[PDB]
Write a protein that binds this ligand. Structure first.
Ligand SMILES: Nc1ncnc2c1ncn2[C@@H]1O[C@H](COP(=O)(O)OP(=O)(O)O)[C@@H](O)[C@H]1O
Ligand SMILES: N#Cc1c[nH]c2ncccc12
Ligand SMILES: [Mg+2]
Lengths: 338, 359
């Protein structure tokens, strides 16, 4: 019942500036007790149009059961007053419970997908719909986790998960070292980092933007793992490893990071496969980039190496949630060239 | 439209590979067979695009420029259908067919500027331009790709079977089976340099590197149409040179344009890198719209055809062209070409229900 009702609302996207300028507990409580059920209900309605053999997997049934229970947990606060202190404190406890309940959503959904794909025939249309759904499902989770964690961290130098002066280069170095450690453990060697930076907006000044560092770290860690693996495997018959070159550029509207390796590249024919849905790190990393209207692209030189590029909005006011909405256009989405 | 247009528009174009075009021009060279194919295929391709011309905005179709293009295509279609009664064994028919292709080629010589002129007028008289009108962008990709394909096929026949039009001795028609990619890069760069020097009295240098992953240390060759490759590189070099000079105009020297040519198992990839300040990601898509240009409309820049037309040439044989920019620093332009001639297959538009739906 509650699912159908709240699915009629459209999600309300927030800017990073809103999350900053705002971060009153009563206001956050009133907003989130409405907004989180809306987002949960919207994606629940989309789960119901997936193939029947996929929805009936124990994994998708778990996700659906968790999301429905969290929606009901949150809807129960609509009968409470924002002035009710126990309700404010219980709301924090409930968000923590919901976050704990959703801790394993990503690997559980992935398990359902893998089980369905391995067991059943998947026509090309269905395969494209699964890509469409998974992008939207995982973006939806990124967004609910973002909002809930903001309220938890603030009300239970950063404003919640947002660093208003994110040291981009420092995140790049941290993500690279994380990948380096795993590369050394597995291969006994790893490429070095050759980093340069260009502050076009503020010449010679350090590069800072408003951003969620954990998101940026996730994107860079995944790209570095892939670039290090490609370098080591492509150059296994070599004494030394070519470095991974990174340039960080702050323009007027955009913050760009380009990661270059000489790991042999990938044929253009199959480059898109890397973004197909464990092999989920790259498509999810692109979701993180697009979440606040950024983007993540790969362009490879098969036989030589690969360039990975992250785009982020440089202005917090333009960093607005990109949210999926279950509406006529979505349902409809589910030969002019030879 | 004439009955011949309606009839032949019902057929789908038949795409060929460069391997076929090569074979049909050398070992499998049979003038009769090429005649039999082209006298049907060229009407089909002309009729298919003529149907899409009819559904353009009435204010655009009625420009003298578009009406002329339509009149040219119809006459060429009629010229070709007149050969449907003749026998391939008729040597006079084969000779007349060559003469007719030369006539059609000369007639279509000014199609691209004529169509572009029409778009310009339709923009001044109605404020409608491909930048904001997705239907016009959609049509122009298909119209220009269609012309690329018909010019390709007719030129192949002319340059192989005509008495006086022999083309390049080392080529099979317009196809170089051993295209020296790096040599075309250098030639295109020099062409762009000469034009850049006339607008700015300076031009960046070329820093070229090459990697033959498929045949290490060997010169990089693929089967390709060098004129098409030259056009793409020339347009991308013009863009990189303008961006570089104007962005570094207060600097004692110019950073070079860096080019890497890589031959892999399936791909030939050319990346052109500049330090010309880059482009905001927001407007990246706008860049590939016909007529979009940050320069005033006039030539070095301003007509806004470089990127979309160059992308058409790349995609014509299943390649691609992308642009990735670091706003505030520079831009990487990347060309992808198929390394195998058997996979270099014509990418052709077809007029059908799907096409009609897009409009
Ligand atoms: N390498 C580059 N660096 C910066 N901007 C570029 C680059 N290449 C293209 N552009 C932008 O894309 C626009 C469209 O380019 P193009 O289609 O070649 O037409 P034109 O060169 O006539 O403008 C240009 O006006 C320019 O603003
Ligand atoms: N992300 C990423 C990658 C960066 N380099 C790569 N080389 C081969 C395959 C994937 C990648
Ligand atoms: Mg240009």
């Amino acid at each position: 019942r509650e699912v159908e009702h709240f699915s009629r609302y459209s999600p309300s996207p927030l800017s990073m500036k809103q999350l900053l300028d705002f971060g009153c507990e009563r206001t956050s409580f009133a907003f989130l007790r409405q907004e989180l059920p809306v987002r949960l209900a919207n994606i629940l309605k989309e789960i119901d149009i997936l193939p029947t053999q996929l929805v009936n997997t124990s994994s998708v049934q778990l996700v659906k059961s968790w999301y429905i229970q969290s929606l009901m947990d949150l809807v129960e606060f609509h009968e409470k007053s924002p002035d009710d202190q126990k309700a404010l404190s219980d709301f924090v406890d409930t968000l923590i419970k919901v976050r704990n309940r959703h801790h394993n959503v990503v690997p559980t959904m992935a398990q359902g997908i893998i089980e369905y794909k391995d067991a059943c025939t998947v026509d090309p249309v269905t395969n494209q719909n699964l890509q469409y759904f998974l992008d939207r499902f995982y973006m939806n989770r990124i967004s609910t986790r973002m909002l809930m964690n903001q309220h938890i961290l603030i009300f239970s130098s950063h404003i919640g998960s947002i660093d208003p002066n994110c040291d981009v280069v420092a995140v790049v170095q941290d993500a690279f070292e994380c990948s380096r450690m795993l590369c050394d453990q597995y291969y006994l060697s790893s490429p070095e980092l050759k980093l340069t930076q260009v502050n076009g907006k503020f010449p010679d000044q350090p590069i800072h933007i408003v951003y969620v560092p954990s998101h940026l770290h996730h994107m860079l860690f995944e790209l570095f793992k892939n670039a290090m693996r490609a370098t080591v495997e492509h150059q296994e018959n070599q004494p030394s490893l070519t470095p991974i070159e990174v340039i960080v550029v702050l323009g007027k509207e955009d913050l760009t990071i380009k990661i270059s390796d000489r790991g042999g590249g990938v044929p253009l024919r199959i480059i898109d496969r890397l973004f197909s849905y464990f092999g989920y790190g790259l498509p999810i990393s692109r979701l993180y980039a697009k979440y606040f209207q950024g983007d993540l692209n790969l362009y490879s030189l098969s036989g030589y190496g690969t360039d990975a590029i992250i785009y982020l909005k440089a202005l917090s006011s333009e960093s607005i949630e990109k949210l999926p909405v279950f509406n006529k256009s979505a349902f409809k989405h589910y030969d002019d060239w030879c």
